[PDB]
Amino acid sequence: ASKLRAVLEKLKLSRDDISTAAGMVKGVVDHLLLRLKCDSAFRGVGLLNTGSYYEHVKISAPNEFDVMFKLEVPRIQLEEYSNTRAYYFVKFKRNENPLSQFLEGEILSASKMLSKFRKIIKEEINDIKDTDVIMKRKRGGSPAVTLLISEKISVDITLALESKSSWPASTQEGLRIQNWLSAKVRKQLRLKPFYLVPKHAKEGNGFQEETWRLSFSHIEKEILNNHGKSKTCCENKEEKCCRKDCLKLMKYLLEQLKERFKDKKHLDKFSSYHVKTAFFHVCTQNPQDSQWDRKDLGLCFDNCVTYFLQCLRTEKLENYFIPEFNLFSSNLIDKRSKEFLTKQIEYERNNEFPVFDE
Template identity: 75%
Template sequence: PLGPAPTFGPREAAPGAWRPRAVLETLRLSRQEISAAAEVVNRVVDHLVQRLQRCESEFRGVTLLRTGSYYERVKISSPNEFDVMFKLEVPRIQLEEYCNSGAHYFVKFKRNPKGNPLSEFLEEEILSASKMLSKFRKIIKEEIKHIEDTDVIVERKRRGSPAVTLLISKPKEIAVDIILALESKSSWPASTKEGLPIDNWLGVKVRNTLRRQPFYLVPKHAKEGNGFQEETWRLSFSHIEKDILKNHGQSKTCCEINGVKCCRKDCLKLMKYLLEQLKKKFRNRKELDKFCSYHVKTAFLHVCTRDPADSQWRCEDLELCFGSCVAYFLHCLETERLEHYFIPGVNLFSPHQIEKPSKEFLSKQIEYERSNGFPVFGEF
């Protein structure tokens, strides 16, 4: 279990005065910008879903699952990146955990009556993530040729990435990550039993309800030596994260029109922006390559677990609350421990995942920012 993270008293506020509200203001995407981008993305995505549902392929059962920061309302900077999941329900599957990883699994089918629509992707008895992903990719590549009034291309495949990335160049540049996800309605794998620690924050009832939702598997391969085990699938709970971020208050009315506003989402936005700006600043160096907004989001969820009361996230305490999130993230970097929020056995900051020098480098940069009033927020 995670030890208590350091907290800061008001006296220890950073010396360089910076104004978090002003920073957030610059991050606010104009409604117009968002709806223009979303309109293009929705048109392309809806076209693809309809075509997949109509064509005689293994993917005709796909439906759309909108996840990611745009739909969680924590998108920052410009609306130029979207994630969408194309989910495919797979009944009667059996999971076999890969190397005690907790997160990666081989997928098998329990009974294989002749009618298994996915049989062409089976490697012996295992549903091959790479085979399925390449066919999915091929169909999408074919389909985007039929989309009118929009310039779309499929980006070159990135090794180990579960996404098919579309680049839309007109009316403006937008990247859309389309992720194929298998939907399973069986109970969540054993590795998640102690995860989702929201009992004291959102309540036991909410946790039970969330755990009754389906879970998803995405074709993100497990690392194997210097390569990847290409047949594996990774658990995904992005739909649950979206739910939590939407209904994030201990009181049911937190941030509703007549409810009291909290600063939880603002803290998450600032944390994401901090990492994004540092990655820009040091884009010519390798140290920050492996860090991503998911690390920030995971740390943030742990802080919400540790400080469950809405009164600990009052809007007027934004600077303190953000300071507390930063301190916790630094604590994770220093101890080389960031537990996956849903699979506590998985340590996202283990030396095996991210080398120590990278963590020390990021830690040093964040310390510098914190001591100097976050100058990086004003750069680029």
């Protein structure tokens, strides 16, 4: 526990780097919001509130940042890419929109949208003269256009259609927070927009470049900051839970494991979204603030680690919002690599976590 307090103390020692670093990110992002609004399609574009540093800037890892550009898109009609409960075709309600230039039938093409997004951004980068910034569009069908700044700091930018209609059927039994946050809050949250991002649905070898995927990062941000059964959790000397510290340690335990196997990238498919998602399932499972007292940090950390282990062991980690979307299927992650991480976390848990030593 005091070993873990030590670990949290160290992480705090870099709270000011990711302060100044994030101020660069916010600075560049604003340049983009200007040029994109000039375009007719992306006219009503704006920043989505998903991050802690500077209100729109999310931190996934040290020196990795994350921004969502939301775009209001009236009259959405969804067609599920069937049996893949998170992936959707997108249609307008038949009568005209400016997004017209991206249709492929009755369908809004994701990659067609993504392509113009990119040329607009790549064009602003080829113009700015103060800083050296570059493009890194590399990874496997990601919706993220990724900028790199002064060879140190990297930003994921995501286009996000905003639908203000009722969440789709695949989320009906998701966001199971009624025991934790309340039936009341779940109705409030599920009244809020949802977002579609242009991560395409695989077709085996390639993709289906007209399919979007659901996102709820703004809900994730809210249930992280408004995290207690008590409405006054973490607001006074008497209600200090360790919920946020427990998510930080989990994210950090994954990053340290990832460095140790930097040789062959044996764990490269694991992700802080996996640790976050699993941490939400624990909160659902332990709903009371009494179950996250601050002086019980070591116990709470174990609770998080075992459920993660169990998720790796069972090859099942449900998306928090779409219960039939299994982030740990073999569609997505090989049997072999999940075995790998179970062995290394199991050992880490059984020996007071030597990965956190000096």
